[model samples]
Target: LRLKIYKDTEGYYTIGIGHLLTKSPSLNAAKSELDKAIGRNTNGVITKDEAEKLFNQDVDAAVRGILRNAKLKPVYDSLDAVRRAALINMVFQMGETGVAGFTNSLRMLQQKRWDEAAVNLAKSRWYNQTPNRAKRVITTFRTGTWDAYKNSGGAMNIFEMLRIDE
Candidate 1:
C-alpha cells in the first residue's frame, strides 16, 4: 500500500508502515516527522524513502522498548534472531505492554517451547483481531525462520533485517 494516513483495524489514525500516530507518545512529534518526510502537514501520501525511514524508526523504538522491560529482557535475550524479530513485530503492533500481557506465551518462548507458545498466542485477543499477521508472526516464532513470510509482497522486506543479524 502507499504510505499514507488511514484508519487501522483498531480505528486509530495510522501512517507509514503501520505507525499508529494515535497511540504514539507524542502526536505533535509524529505529525511533524511525517510533515518533514512528505513535505506537508496535510496527510495524503508519502514517498518510499519517507515510509522506510518512519518504519525503521518505529522498529528501533519497538526493539528499545522491549529491551527496556525488566521482565522481558531476559526472555527476549533467550530467543534467536527469528523469534526475537517475531517479538519485536508483536511489540510494534501492540506495544510493549500488550506483548508483555502474553505471560504464558512468553514463558513458553523462554523455555523454547515453540508449539506451546504458538498455541498460547492463538488464544489471544490479538490473534482474533489480526489473524493473518498474527499467523505469520506466530509461525515465525514457532519455526524460527522466514518461511511464513516468504513471497509476502510489498515493503515486507523492511522487516527482514530483524529476523536475522542483517
Candidate 2:
C-alpha cells in the first residue's frame, strides 16, 4: 500500500510478493533473482508459477536478513513458529533496514515484552498507513499465535504460505 515499496510504477513493472523489482546488480546476477524470472513474462503477465518462485526466493532472503541481524537473532531465536512468521512477514514487506528502524520495538521483543513491542509498532507511520495488516502483525506479536492469520487474505497468508523450517 506504500509507494515504491511493494509496487513500482516507474518505467517497467517489477513485481514482488510485497516488493518491487529493482535493477540492482545482485538481483540481475542471481539466476533466480529477477531477470530470468520476470523475463518469462508473456504480454506483461507472469504466471503464478513464476510469481510463487520469486515469492519464495524473496521470503528466503527476508529470512536470511532476520537471521543475519545480530540484534534480531536473539529475538528470533526466542520466538515460536507463529511469532517468527510475524517477524518474517514484517521483514518481507519492509526489508531488514526498514524493520531495523524499530530499535525500541526490537529491544522490547528481545526482552519478551510483547505488549510494549506491539504498542511501539503501532506508533509507526507504517502502522498508520496499513492499519489492518499492521494490526494483525502487532496482535500476532502480542498473542504469539496464528489466530490473526486465520482466513486472512492477501500476503498476510505468509503466516501460512511460508514454511519456516529454520
Candidate 3:
C-alpha cells in the first residue's frame, strides 16, 4: 500500500514505505541518488526495481517475525517450501498477531489438517478480499503444487502472484 516518491499535505521529498521523508543511510550519496535512483523532481518518483526491493524487505521482516511464535512452529516446520512461503505471505499481510488469531487454522496446521486449515482460511476476510491468493494458498496448503493454478498451468500461482519466490 505504501510505495512511491511523493509529497505530504505541506510538501516534502518523500519516498519508500509510508512515503518516508528521507533517503538511504548515506551522507556521501550523489545527486544521482535523488534524480536517477528515486526519480525525484516535483511530485517525485520511484523505480519498479526499487519498489520490489522494498516489498521484499517488508515481507522478509514479517516472515521472520512469524518464527517468534511458539504455537505455529509445528506447522511451519512441517510445511513444504511453497506452503511455507504462502504462510509468510499471510504473515506479511496480516501481521504475526493476525496469524495468531487464526486459532482453528493454526490448530489444523499443527495437527497436519491441511483440508481443515484450508477451509478455516476461507472463513477469513482475507480470503474474501483476495480470492485468487486464498485459493492458491489453500490449494498449496493441501497439495504441494498449486492445484488451483490458472493461466498457463502453474507458472502464476499464489507464490508467484504474491512474490513468495524467495
What's the TM-score of each model vs. the native?
Answer: 0.80, 0.73, 0.65
lDDT of 2 by residue, 109-152 (tens): 88889999999999998898778778888888899876765665
* 1-166: candidate 1 lDDT, tens digit per residue: 3466766665556676676566555546556656765666645567777777777888989989988997678888998877887888888777899988888999999999999999999999999978877888888889988787665632234275333211
Task: Please give the distance, in angstroms, between residue 87's alpha carbon in candidate 1 and its true position after superposition.
Answer: 0.3
Q: Candidate 2: which stretches are off by over 4 Å?
A: 1-16, 22-35, 39-41, 151-166
Q: Model 3: which residue pairs collide?
A: none
lDDT, residue 9, model 3? 34
Top candidate (lDDT): 1
Off by over 4 Å in 3: 1-44, 150-159, 164-166
- Cα deviation at 64, candidate 3, in Å, is 1.3
Locate the minimum summed-lDDT window of 10 residues in model 2: 1-10
Superior by TM-score: candidate 1 or candidate 3: 1
Mind giving the per-residue lDDT tens digits that candidate 3 earns over 1-166?
Answer: 3344554333444445432344543322322344554445423445667666666667667667877777666667877776776687677666777778888988887677888988889999878876776777677777766555555345433335454322
Sliding window of 10 residues with minimal summed lDDT for model 3: 24-33
